[PDB]
UniProtKB/Swiss-Prot annotation, chains A, B:
GO terms, molecular function: L-Ala-D/L-Glu epimerase activity; metal ion binding; racemase and epimerase activity; racemase and epimerase activity, acting on amino acids and derivatives
Protein name: L-Ala-D/L-Glu epimerase
Cofactor(s) required for function per UniProt: Mg(2+)
Keyword Cell wall biogenesis/degradation: yes
EC assignment: 5.1.1.20
PANTHER family membership: O-SUCCINYLBENZOATE SYNTHASE (PTHR48073:SF2), O-SUCCINYLBENZOATE SYNTHASE-RELATED (PTHR48073)
Binding-site residues for Mg(2+), renumbered to this chain: D186, E214, D239
Amino acid sequence: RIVNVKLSLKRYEYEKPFHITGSVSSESRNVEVEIVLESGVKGYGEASPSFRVNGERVEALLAIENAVREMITGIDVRNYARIFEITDRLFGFPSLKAAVQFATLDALSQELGTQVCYLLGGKRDEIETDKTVGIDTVENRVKEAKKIFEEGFRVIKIKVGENLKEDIEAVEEIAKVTRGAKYIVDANMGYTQKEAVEFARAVYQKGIDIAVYEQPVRREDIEGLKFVRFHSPFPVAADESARTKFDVMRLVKEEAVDYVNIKLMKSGISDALAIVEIAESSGLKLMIGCMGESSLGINQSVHFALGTGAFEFHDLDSHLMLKEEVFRGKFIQDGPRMRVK
Amino acid sequence: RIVNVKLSLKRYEYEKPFHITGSVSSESRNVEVEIVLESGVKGYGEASPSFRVNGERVEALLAIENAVREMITGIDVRNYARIFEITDRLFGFPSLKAAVQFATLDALSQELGTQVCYLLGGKRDEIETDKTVGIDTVENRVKEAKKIFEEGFRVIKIKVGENLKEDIEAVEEIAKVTRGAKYIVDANMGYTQKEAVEFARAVYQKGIDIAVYEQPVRREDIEGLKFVRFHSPFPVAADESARTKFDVMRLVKEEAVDYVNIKLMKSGISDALAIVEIAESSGLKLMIGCMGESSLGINQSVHFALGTGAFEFHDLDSHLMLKEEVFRGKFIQDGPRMRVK
Ligand SMILES: [Mg+2]
Ligand SMILES: [Mg+2]
């Protein structure tokens, strides 16, 4: 049983400012979660709160430490479903919900003598992540893309959303110098429905293929997501629009998207598991993403992906963008490849 | 790693012939499944094939033992998701798919020093099952119902579907001698849409409440299930119409039913987990049922229900209707109650 829970502020600085539509980040402020069991076992998780997406603020997460402690201490991690249901009440603190739920599985797997990925199915032994090119001048974007390409990455995620004309140019210029790579374009809600369609058609006309076109429109515009899906050639994904299992059931019912970018930071383990099942029971396909997690945090998604093996693409590169002294993941990072120990 | 998979015929006779719409059974022929690991650990499952619902035949299941061995021998149970994906190909032998998948978890749980229910979440420590009153003369039905009530069962499942007039009479008579009990009425596809509605209204008019009204119409008549749901006062459940996770996604999209009676014999563990998540992500509610499983087979559903804790009602009484010399479930049967050891 859980005898204590501790929350701690952990700051990581980006190697370079990370610019996306409506947001520039120079630092990633996360909340580390440690769960202690009567047996002495300690489970760890990391919350990377998002004000833009989840409406969270790091100070707010740290402020409810006592409440979280009261909610879960006294429960046996072998009854993890009880912990999941309880933490589901933390829908206003989803990144914390995620960190606590994973810490629970982390502690449980240790007690059972296995790893989290195996507890979840042990589907895959290896996955590959893409790497992101933040918004910058076309010249700098091209430079970064070439660099990411030389590092061995074959899926390059390109941020766009603030300047349609320049975004088109940027994608076209990046494609020319990274022949052989697949591309994921993420607008982070920056385009109107029609601009989103025009962006896709312009790129398509140049003979470029986009593997996943992430959240082109505003989060509440479900009909807009569908409009883009039905009027442009590339698979459309919901990110900001897909936070809970309920959001996904609606997206599927409305036939709004081809993909859903699952993020533990938005859904927690509980909703992520539901979303994986919904996707496997429908025409929906999935990719797994991240926010500002460090290696300890990305580890949560690596085990989820390896265990479920439910993702077509993996955008788990936040830890590669942050400055960190010691690697704290429970997985092996081999270039773009991530493997189980 | 799996080194052996054994299938064997096990016959169990009913204490009394079991009569339901379009089917009378005096014997239950099951296929016991044993999976042996290199470590010596042995996992067990049981398939209770259904010609009527799944189109299966026991002889057919037994005939494919070599194929099953070739499909999963050599796979480590810690990669159970791989075994699940492979066995999902046995959609034509769903009861065997179920037995193999559970035996896999039974074996894995032992290697991890835990139980299947805990591997699935350990949500609950106890569940209660109803007991069924088969079709017979109103006099024999009321007699059996009274006997069941006296045994401590507070949820009584009543079979109907072959004679609306008598069915109504039967439910009305049973209700007066079992005050305090909840009732589940199961027509096993015997009624037309209008008859189904009339049945519910007739019973409703007498002040009788039906907790779950199971599959009133034919399996392909999804619109009919919806019609009954929208035109009669009681919760309507899909049983025969809900075999796979895809069937359920469709039922949810069509808003066809209030309930889905999940059976491992129809869905196997893989699809059952998907249906649980779909239900928890929608307005759908669930009950868990059975076919002709003996105690070893019912053990599979007891662990699934205890672990997920996703069911409002449990209809796991097939082993209570069969003559069995020795109890073989890895659970405690205490009257209507079933608990974890
Ligand atoms: Mg995104
Ligand atoms: Mg039924």
